């Protein structure tokens, strides 16, 4: 009866690397200016997110959704995160994965309705941590799990039904981000079709990095692991992989958000690993490279403190290339 004061359950650490994304950064005639609200590069895909931002406002997106298909490490989230900011200064944005719906504490219905209510002030699911059951104690009650009954879900759905015309309660459809869309089977793909028939459902952005793959759940192959009844209602934005000039600019914003002054010699060697191995690994080194400079007391990361942490921590490309060699010598007689 009295829950507006407990509206604070927001993911800060997972989406905390996208702290320098304050919007798409577009002009009044849809043209990116190569540096705007922290976003750097990606000229082709950022313009296509502006056209989607139009069709949400006039109301042409009803019965449609967006799909972002590109290589991993090419800003598939930072485009979908800035669209939460450019659509409004306070929009909900939940970025659950595809494999995070196959759990054992709930079904695939209680784990996908929990995403469709976390993206509709406060979110609508945020009412269901206080108006459903009393929790919020120490660590093992995060390990333990209670359920939110459907009869609780029709108490809140009938509460705000008369507050809509009251004026003080306003609804804001946010943006749900289902990463790794091919992991979902069609026992849940027929639940996205049920919820997008509503009058308050958010815009549904998905992402994948797979070509013609198999639909999980059946024995047929479709593009991107999405059924063909739902592929014929999608807008597909594609991303282009970064270059040797865009990657130098990305890490310069991230060192600013983590107060480490690196030399210009160290910046051209950190994009050298970024061009070769990965982009989510090059920003991972920055914390563990500064901590070695602090123990030798310089407060300025040189090129030797990069090639030390490059030899200590591996990456995903080398950690399986070396175990391939050992399982080859183990196979040999």
């Amino acid at each position: 009866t009295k829950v507006p004061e407990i509206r604070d359950v927001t993911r800060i650490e997972r989406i905390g690397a996208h702290s320098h994304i304050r919007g798409l950064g577009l002009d009044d005639a849809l043209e990116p200016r190569q540096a705007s609200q922290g976003m750097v590069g990606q000229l082709a895909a950022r313009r296509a997110a502006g056209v989607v931002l139009e069709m949400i406002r006039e109301g042409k997106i009803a019965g449609r959704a967006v799909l972002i298909a590109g290589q991993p490490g090419t800003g598939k989230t930072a485009i979908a995160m800035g669209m939460a900011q450019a659509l409004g200064p306070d929009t909900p944005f939940t970025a659950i994965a595809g494999s995070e719906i196959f759990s054992l504490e709930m079904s695939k219905t209680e784990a996908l309705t929990q995403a469709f209510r976390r993206s509709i002030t406060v979110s609508l699911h945020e009412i269901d941590v206080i108006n459903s059951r009393t929790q919020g104690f120490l660590a093992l009650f995060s390990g333990d799990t209670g359920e939110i009954k459907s009869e609780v879900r029709e108490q809140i759905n009938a509460k705000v039904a008369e507050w809509r015309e009251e004026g003080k309660a306003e609804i804001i459809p946010g943006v749900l981000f289902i990463d790794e869309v091919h992991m979902l089977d069609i026992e849940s793909f027929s639940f996205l079709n049920r919820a997008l028939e509503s009058d308050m459902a958010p815009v549904l952005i998905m992402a994948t990095n797979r070509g013609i793959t198999r639909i999980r759940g059946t024995s047929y192959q479709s593009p991107h692991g999405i059924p063909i009844d739902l592929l014929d209602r999608l807008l597909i934005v594609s991303t282009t992989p970064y270059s040797e000039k865009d990657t130098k600019q990305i890490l310069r914003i991230r060192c600013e958000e983590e107060d480490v002054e690196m030399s210009e010699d160290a910046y051209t060697v950190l994009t050298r690993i970024g061009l070769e191995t990965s982009l989510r690994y090059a920003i991972q080194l920055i914390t563990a490279a500064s901590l070695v400079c602090r123990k030798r007391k310089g407060t300025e990361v040189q090129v030797d403190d990069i090639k030390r942490v490059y030899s200590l921590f591996l990456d995903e490309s080398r950690s399986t290339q070396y175990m391939k060699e050992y399982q080859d010598a183990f196979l040999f007689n």
Binding site: A29, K60, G211, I212
Partner: protein
Amino acid sequence: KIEEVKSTTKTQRIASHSHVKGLGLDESGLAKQAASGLVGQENAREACGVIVELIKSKKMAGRAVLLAGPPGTGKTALALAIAQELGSKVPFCPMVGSEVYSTEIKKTEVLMENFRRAIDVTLHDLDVANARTDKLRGEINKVVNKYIDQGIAELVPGVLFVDEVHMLDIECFTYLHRALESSIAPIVIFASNRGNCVIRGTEDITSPHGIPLDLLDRVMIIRTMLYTPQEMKQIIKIRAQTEGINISEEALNHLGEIGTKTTLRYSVQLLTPANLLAKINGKDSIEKEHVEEISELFYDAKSSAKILADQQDKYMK
């Protein structure tokens, strides 16, 4: 007890077929080139002119229609125009084949609430006022049977469209086949775009169209052909003037050559985000500079996997 439950219809399903008024036939039984919304497809439009005769002359007892053709050749429009030939708002409930794989509700209730959505008031329209379920339908069937034996309310058969039929398993084909042998049952028009497939649930039986041979010999097959690049533009021209989207002639023919590489449902989908991009530049219609700009921002599904697969080999060594 309540008989004003006016509208409870999935409008977003049949929003793309707003211009389909009729089959467009002559009184002799021949098809015209462009009449009542439809354009071309003279073979399948004459064949649906026989189905609307066998329905009216009480000769469709036990039979059904399978519209078999490539995707994007208007199998939904010829199964929607077949509902306006029956006359005066005969219902129509389209559904995909993969709709019955819902976890929260059983498969025997999804296909049943679609049958009671096709049989003015529909039968599922009366089943949402009396909720505010199998035990409720015992008395709702009773009062509509009470009304016809009184002689007030007339019962009409609808049209029930099941698209993507190869994903229906063997346990749901038998549930349909037990309902086709009723007296008040609607016509159960299917749709498939495939050849020989495996019946889902047996894993060894290869069958035509993913359909068992018990139901297949109670089925009349109608073939829809592909579209010419001349008749492709006349489809987009009707959809541009029904939505209020002016379009130049030089830009319409470029949008009609995109639909000769992809399906036709990709070209009609590009009408809205090209028109809203032409409102940014301060114009009323769309030109060749706009349609060439959308075709480099948005991709079709088949040419988006070709981008990722041709980089999949070069990313993994």
